Amino acid sequence: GEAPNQALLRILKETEFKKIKVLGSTVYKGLWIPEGEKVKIPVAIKELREATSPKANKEILDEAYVMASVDNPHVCRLLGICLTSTVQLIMQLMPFGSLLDYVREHKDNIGSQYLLNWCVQIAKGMNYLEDRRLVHRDLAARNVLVKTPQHVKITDFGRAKLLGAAAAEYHAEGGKVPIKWMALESILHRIYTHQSDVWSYGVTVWELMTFGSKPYDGIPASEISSILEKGERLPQPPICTIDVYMIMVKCWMIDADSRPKFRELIIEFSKMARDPQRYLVIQGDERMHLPEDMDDVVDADEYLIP
Numbered sequence: 001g002e003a004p005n006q007a008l009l010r011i012l013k014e015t016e017f018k019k020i021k022v023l024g025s026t027v028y029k030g031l032w033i034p035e036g037e038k039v040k041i042p043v044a045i046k047e048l049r050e051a052t053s054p055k056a057n058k059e060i061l062d063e064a065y066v067m068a069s070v071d072n073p074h075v076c077r078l079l080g081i082c083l084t085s086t087v088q089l090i091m092q093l094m095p096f097g098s099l100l101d102y103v104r105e106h107k108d109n110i111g112s113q114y115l116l117n118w119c120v121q122i123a124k125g126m127n128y129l130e131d132r133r134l135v136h137r138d139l140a141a142r143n144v145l146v147k148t149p150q151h152v153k154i155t156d157f158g159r160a161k162l163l164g165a166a167a168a169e170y171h172a173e174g175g176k177v178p179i180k181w182m183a184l185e186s187i188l189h190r191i192y193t194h195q196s197d198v199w200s201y202g203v204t205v206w207e208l209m210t211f212g213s214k215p216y217d218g219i220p221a222s223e224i225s226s227i228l229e230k231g232e233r234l235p236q237p238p239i240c241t242i243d244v245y246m247i248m249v250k251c252w253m254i255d256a257d258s259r260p261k262f263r264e265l266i267i268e269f270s271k272m273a274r275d276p277q278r279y280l281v282i283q284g285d286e287r288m289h290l291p292e293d294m295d296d297v298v299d300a301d302e303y304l305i306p
């Protein structure tokens, strides 16, 4: 046996929400007004392109299946879908964009407290995904979103695989892949587990401590297998103490069960977030600070449906 997934999929009318402007090329920034609820919820609307490509609709509703089946503060909520000519995913708007573009744009403004809180919240998000027997398979800084600089959510469940009642690792077959974030076992034999997610968590933390540097930048993805089998890893980022970087190294052990458990990463970064300056050394660290009637505006996170 396995647990029934009793998640609600909400179908929304096109009339319940107003497309304000474009965010990506087709993701819109908009507002959702639940019929006779007197609440305005900032939303990001993912609308299909051609939306006649059957295989593309499979993907998007598979994203929807996974996103509806998650309810955690460090993982982004699917608010519902609109079944129009072109399927629309309606999600909580994460106004400040991908954490990757965030650390790139604000490296001069990002203190140790924020980096180390980001490491914890992402690890809470991921440890929630392990609790729900779910393997992300595409965790990177690009796929973490910034509701505020104090609060990030894991995203892109387009590659997430909902493990079996005894499916030890998720077998897969071909496509475009995240080589430079991937556990060695995934590159070589397409093995993906909560542990191979932890590996990508390590590349995710590396990206954050380097303020968004490209992992193995200028190294073809063809060699990455041989480089990792040869024992090579990503280098210690400047701002990183041996401590922090040693947690990243542990995430990249070849023995999967020798890597840290997400619940462990929470504890370890939590400890370090209690004394951030002792664990991350950044020029001017203490100096650092970060941020049409909207009367009935309410964040997705304060909008609860039973």
Ligand SMILES: */C=C/C(=O)Nc1cc(-c2ccccc2)ccn1
Pocket: 023, 024, 027, 044, 075, 076, 077, 091, 092, 093, 094, 095, 097, 098, 145, 153, 154, 155, 156
């Ligand atoms: C998990 C919620 C979510 O995706 N919110 C969101 C997403 C974007 C976005 C989507 C696709 C590409 C770029 C940016 C922007 C704001 N919130």
